[PDB]
Amino acid sequence: AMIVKEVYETAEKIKSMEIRGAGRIARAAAQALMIQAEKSKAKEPEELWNELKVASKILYNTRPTAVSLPNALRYVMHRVKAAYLGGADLETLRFTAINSAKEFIYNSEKAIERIGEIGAKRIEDGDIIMTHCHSKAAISVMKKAFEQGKNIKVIVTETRPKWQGKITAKELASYGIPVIYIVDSAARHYMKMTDKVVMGANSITANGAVINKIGTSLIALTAKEHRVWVMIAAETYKFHPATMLGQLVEIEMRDPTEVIPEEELRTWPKNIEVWNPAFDVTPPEYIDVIITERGIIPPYAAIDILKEEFGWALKYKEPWED
Amino acid sequence: AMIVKEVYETAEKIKSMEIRGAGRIARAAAQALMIQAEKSKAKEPEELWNELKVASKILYNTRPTAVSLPNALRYVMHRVKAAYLGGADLETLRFTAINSAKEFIYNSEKAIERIGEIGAKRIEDGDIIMTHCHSKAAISVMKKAFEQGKNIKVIVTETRPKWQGKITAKELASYGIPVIYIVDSAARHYMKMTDKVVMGANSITANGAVINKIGTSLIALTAKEHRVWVMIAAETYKFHPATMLGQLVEIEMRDPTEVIPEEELRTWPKNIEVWNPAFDVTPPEYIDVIITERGIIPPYAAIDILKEEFGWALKYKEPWED
Amino acid sequence: AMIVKEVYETAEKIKSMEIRGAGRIARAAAQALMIQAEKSKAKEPEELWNELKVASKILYNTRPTAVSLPNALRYVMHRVKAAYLGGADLETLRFTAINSAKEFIYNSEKAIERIGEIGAKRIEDGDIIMTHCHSKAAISVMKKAFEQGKNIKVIVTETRPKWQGKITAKELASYGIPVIYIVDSAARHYMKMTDKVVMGANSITANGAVINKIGTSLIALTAKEHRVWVMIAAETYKFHPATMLGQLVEIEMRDPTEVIPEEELRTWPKNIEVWNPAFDVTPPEYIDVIITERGIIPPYAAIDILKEEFGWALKYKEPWED
Amino acid sequence: AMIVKEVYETAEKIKSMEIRGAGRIARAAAQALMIQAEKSKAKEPEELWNELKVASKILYNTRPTAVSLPNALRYVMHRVKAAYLGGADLETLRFTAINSAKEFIYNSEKAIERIGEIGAKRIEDGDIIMTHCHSKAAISVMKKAFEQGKNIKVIVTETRPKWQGKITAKELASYGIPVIYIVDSAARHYMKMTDKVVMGANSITANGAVINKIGTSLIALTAKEHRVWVMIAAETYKFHPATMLGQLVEIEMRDPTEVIPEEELRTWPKNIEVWNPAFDVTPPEYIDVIITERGIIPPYAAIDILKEEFGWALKYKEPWED
Amino acid sequence: AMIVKEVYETAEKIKSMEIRGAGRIARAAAQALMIQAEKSKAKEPEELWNELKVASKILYNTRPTAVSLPNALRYVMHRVKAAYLGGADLETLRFTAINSAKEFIYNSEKAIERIGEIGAKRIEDGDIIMTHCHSKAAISVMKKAFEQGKNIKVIVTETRPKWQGKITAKELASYGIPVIYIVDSAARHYMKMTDKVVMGANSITANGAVINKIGTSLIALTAKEHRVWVMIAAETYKFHPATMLGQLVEIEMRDPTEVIPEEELRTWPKNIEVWNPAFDVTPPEYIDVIITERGIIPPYAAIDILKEEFGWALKYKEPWED
Amino acid sequence: AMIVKEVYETAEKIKSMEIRGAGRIARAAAQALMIQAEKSKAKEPEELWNELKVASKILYNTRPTAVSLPNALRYVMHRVKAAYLGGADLETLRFTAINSAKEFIYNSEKAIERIGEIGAKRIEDGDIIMTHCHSKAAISVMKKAFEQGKNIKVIVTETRPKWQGKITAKELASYGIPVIYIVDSAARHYMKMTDKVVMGANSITANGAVINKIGTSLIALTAKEHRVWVMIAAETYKFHPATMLGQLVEIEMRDPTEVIPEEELRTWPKNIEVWNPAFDVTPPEYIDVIITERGIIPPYAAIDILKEEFGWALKYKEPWED
Ligand SMILES: Nc1nc2c(ncn2[C@@H]2O[C@H](COP(=O)(O)O)[C@@H](O)[C@H]2O)c(=O)[nH]1
Ligand SMILES: Nc1nc2c(ncn2[C@@H]2O[C@H](COP(=O)(O)O)[C@@H](O)[C@H]2O)c(=O)[nH]1
Ligand SMILES: Nc1nc2c(ncn2[C@@H]2O[C@H](COP(=O)(O)O)[C@@H](O)[C@H]2O)c(=O)[nH]1
Ligand SMILES: Nc1nc2c(ncn2[C@@H]2O[C@H](COP(=O)(O)O)[C@@H](O)[C@H]2O)c(=O)[nH]1
Ligand SMILES: O=P(O)(O)OC[C@H]1O[C@H](OP(=O)(O)O)[C@H](O)[C@@H]1O
């Protein structure tokens, strides 16, 4: 019942995309569970457990499509449930919460680094790399390859409606990496000069499909058409365990006003419908590798990642549920 | 030289895309040679011939990619040059020019209406049609299909950078046609629900390729992927003579600020280049039919349309040349 | 008003498929117009013309999909109309009818022969040929190749629902050609041992698609997948002129009882719907050549055939119309 | 040797396909070793072990392609052989056999229900699903989807020669599900309206190929063409151990008269051979997922299912061998 | 007949490939017809006609695959035969042979020079160009583009067995064009860096296939795979008129000693057969353009080139026949 | 260190390719480590360790592309290093080197013999088999299938530049297998008649790509094109462990004199560069199976072979390092 103000604030900021990026929203939800445990006023273990269940729900019900977020909450809450059920007292429960969130947030940082170090080995001197949206994991790859002294260049697609290519362009330029900035429709037109495509992921499924920013699948299609390697930089917590048992991943339909600003859109007639999918599905046949913190896999090995690290939990209900 | 106001105003409105659309700029270019010949104060054929030569040059030197523009100038000036070299006095030459240009304008209007009637027979009741940019020819097909009582819906892509899709969406909604407005990036995601794709052309080459608004090649590519018919609606003067003797069509690179506004681009680091190609090249394999005003063709029959209608002029210079 | 009994009988037999095969039903409709003219009791030219208009309609409204039939009727009726309108008397009109039908029927026979002679040159000694349905034009090819002394073998697909493979099997066996008879679902399974596919056509369209017996498109798909040449044996009157101006070809939906016999089908519940398309469309990308009486063309040249021999008539309404 | 009536009656009902379906014949084969051990009058382990050996041989030697049958025999007899070689007395061995076979039967029933629950999550409301033959596993998915209130329709292919599609259509219509019944040949024509394909398996090989009813490879091929998901519903005992060490799966050639009835075939010329393969091989590339009772896999993960569940037995002989 | 030595030397040097290339050998058969006529000791017009018919057969029976050679003999002998049947006296006939030969020889040189100018327009500055064998038509494109100031590099495949890549390497190096020389097997490895492919043609068939040096089809395949333009530079006399009536082009099989020298091959055992096909067949779908002296065509308009230039001649027997 | 002559002779004969094949050179580096140990004059365990580390570096720096060679050196030196760090005395260490070498050499011979038996099961009587270079693993499949009584023929591509096809041709002819010998360029021409492709492998990466003799990827491409199985016969020590952490496999570039002999090359001009890549990269989508000594895997499970056998070793530095 008694939820801190930071949990609510994190939720509002994830919903609104003030905070965004699959990896970042996951860390932000771990963080919010950390703070709820730190600042809790509860006296019983039962009453902390109840606050953590509710803050978890509040954070789960922000954005559907990126499984990183649910996975972050599970990382904490599996550990919190097993403590509460194993009979821990208040402070042992509170530490379990805080130190689990801390581990996740730390593992997320190290994994993004390691993904960089590993993807970079596939970038050769002189490469022209196309990317899409703004993915920390993809950027960690391009960044490390530059620092290795490879003279790379990155074709950045503006990525409508939310324009996150701008973020990517300025970030890459800031490290000294030259950028070619283009609208999304130019991807095919520039694929003939591209050597590598490198993008992120919000969720990766049992059969190896990659759910990522709207337009990703298009870029992968023409990449394949041209024999340009498509490389998906993604952490193991981007892999989606409900899919092993048949679950389809919800594609988030965001507000039409992101596409057409409110002032303008109110003047349009009723029989125009603005549709704003935030993600699309890229089939595994159009992906050459997925680069996780544990190494290069072909996308069809997504099921191995899911088996060895998440399978166990699918016989149990969700670790924030009553 | 002594060129009329309306030749400069038209040429600069083509340049700024205040007047746009491959058809319309071709009518506008004819309409301007027309007003030059109307208001010319020359007192001698050779003086007016020289006026019309120079007005043509100015109109050619505006935008390069849509061969519709030079085909319109060719249409007036092949005739004006034949009359002048024949011996025509002033009023004969003036009438030749004025009338030639009226023919082209009337023929362009009729050709478009015709393309709509033909193309609409390839549209079936219940069809969801995806389009791109704003093409009068493609709209003619859609409009006509709807007037025939086929219950259609058109998926309109916004069409970055210049947003012509906004025009398309308001235009079709105003004729009664339900519109689904999406970003260019969503073309693959929504290709599964799409029955037909209907797009325009700016240039059609000898070997069947179609130069049309940037992103056309992506839509076409993924339409092939999904076995959706790609129909290109295009008047015969969209077809490109010079491609018969090996000519590559230039792709217009327009100003970076169409993508990133001036107020913002000036703040961006020097090592980001913004690249804004106005068109791309869709290869023939991804096109099912080109609809002309003389009927349905496979795209590899573009050489026939050009052999029969344009071939004769390629042993000559341009009809505005010294 | 006064229509002979043979016209009605031909119609009933075309509807029912007692007479069948694109080529044969065309000759049978020429024949029926022949007999109506031969036996007519009319005294005025106006009154023969009126009987021929009506018998033509009766024959047009038998089966939609095979354009051979409409083309046969036009071959006669274009010539009859131009005579009647040019002022011919009764007997001159009657001869024009009879002798036009005679020419068509003769040209049909010679064309099927010539198609044989030309297709056969593409059959090599030892070839294994898959066919589908029963096509005289396809059979003329296999037959001639055998008589040339090539030791061929033909995989005949049974061709459901109407089982016309049986006809093909017995006919080929009768000339001494060995046959492998298979259900339609085995086509892919046996494509690896097949050297050539050779099928007929009911209608061929402007952009080069081939409308032929249901299942043709499937056979062509896997043929292409395997690099097995697909050869369509077809007369110029199989080419469909309404398509040059955008017309879609009606696919005939025949009686469900052809699939499931009446005795049985009456016992099935209402929420099962038997659907019986008689034809499908094979796209031109899956056809290597069309073999007409005038030679080998790639399917994209279907528009050339249509242009040079049928284009002229599309400005006029139908030559049996009032 | 002394074999019970029910072993012969079952073996000959498998042979005649009076009992058919890869699952069902596997349950039937277990059910027969069960009834042998029940009613055996042996008074000594070695006598009963020899009875069960010989009953197994007889049951193996019925139909070769569906590895479900020998996996069922392996399931009983690996256990029966371990007990006998362990020293088990008569009643221990008899119980081992009787109970082993009951386990397999209970597990097969549960596995199928489970596959339906998992697979139905990949089915969406409004989906038109095309199926082939009659597969209990595929039907489980469809049935379950419908019980979940997804408004579906199933296109059922009749499935020549043996017409199993009739069974499928009456079965789904009797649970309330609207059915569209078509011939195998119409699969491509109706693939454009199809959202999902759901088919069963008889054998799944190490490299991911799927041996299933003849025609499956065509449906799959053209589903890929159109980007329709191909889902194969298959229990883990449909997976084929021996393919791990290079074994080609034999394709069952059944009797010509299943195609052409005896009354008719006897009248046909000697130079027609009728070829009736019962199955074909769909390669992994054309399959999106295999749905097992342990979840969704890419088809290239069939080696994992076999490494983990079957690998150990390949250094041994069959558990019925001398 | 009294056949001059120069005819027998030309045939010998064509069989041995001392004189080679489809154009070159065409010119050489014209040259030799020209010399038969110039040096003939024939007193009567009957006697010269017979000497030329015989010289023509001799030349035709050297190398079957390149149609250029017989098309040359036609050009002369069609004209020599019209003269003779029209009743020409001796010196009239002799001159017709001589001036027909000289016409063909001059047109060949023009056509090749003009293919250069047309083709060069498709080469863009910076281009890397892969070629195969030694084609004068291909070399004229590459040479002309270099003379226009475009910095190119050419990847010359060595072209086994006869090593003609060596002739091409030295030839392009001698015009100042940098060459990269590689074994045939490396064509795919280096296709990623290739911008354009440019090759010649020995015969081009009615549906667009290009018969050219063994290996041409593999380069074209991987070229397509990587979306690299494949351009065939071919005079109109390489188009194969017999193919319009279904004829297959024979693939010349040459001595096994070209592959393994005789010192070595004689030691090898009998159960090694060495097969040396001199040409293969590229299908039209892997060819983007044929460049002829009259323009750029898609491969599918090869039939138009044939209909309009050689199609007349197919109803008559070969000029040199009686 | 005191390195024995046999180590320096082995390195020299590996660089010059006098000893070649990925397996063979692996065994030869083991053999040489074995001889360093056998003939060592080292009085102390420190001194032998240093002599082996140095001999290992020498052997590693011969030919980079074949991972078999370093994987052999690992097998020994991992074990030699465990002994030394565990504190082993001299003769303990020396034996560990000798018995580790002998272990690897015996396992290699077994693995190849066993690949033969597994692979042969996929060869079917009548098969025509195309191969490339000279692979002992591929040859063992083909040999074993012939010894099983299956009548096969093998198409041996000559494999330029080093002509290893000659070694394969004589070798298979010597077991009584008929060979068809052809230039590399003819692979597509003869793929129509080929039933199976069987080739070796120098390294196999984490996502399934196969690095093998230059040309391998072209054969695999056209094989895929024609639906011919491509089978890679490769021991588990050809799988490349460094690729799991993103490393790219280096392509050895060898002397240009292998392509053009020095007598001739010295005469050629400087602006001809001769490039001699020894390997190319076949992507996994063009490979149907890898045959290892432990079974058949789809190319996408190369990662499982690596995880389960070599994955442990990646956190440590190379055994021969300090
Ligand atoms: N749409 C969708 N596809 C998924 C999901 N999980 C896995 N997939 C797989 O992703 C692929 C999508 O291919 P597409 O339909 O884009 O051609 C399918 O093969 C499907 O099996 C999911 O949640 N949604
Ligand atoms: N369905 C249909 N397609 C036609 C017709 N005429 C021409 N076509 C062409 O045939 C092709 C059919 O391809 P599909 O949809 O089978 O992939 C299309 O590209 C279409 O333009 C017609 O009457 N009906
Ligand atoms: N082999 C061969 N193919 C020819 C010839 N003329 C035309 N073709 C055409 O060339 C193509 C060969 O394609 P492939 O079978 O190599 O994939 C087909 O479209 C075929 O119909 C000829 O003389 N020989
Ligand atoms: N060139 C190269 N490709 C590799 C290597 N390791 C794995 N690959 C994979 O091999 C494939 C090469 O395909 P290609 O670009 O030839 O079409 C890709 O899937 C790529 O990601 C390596 O070391 N080099
Ligand atoms: O002639 P219509 O069919 O209207 O349009 C033809 C094409 O020309 C336009 O170019 P732009 O907007 O002027 O750059 C668009 O690319 C459009 O599809």
Ligand SMILES: [K+]
């Ligand atoms: K669709």
Ligand SMILES: [K+]
């Ligand atoms: K569909």
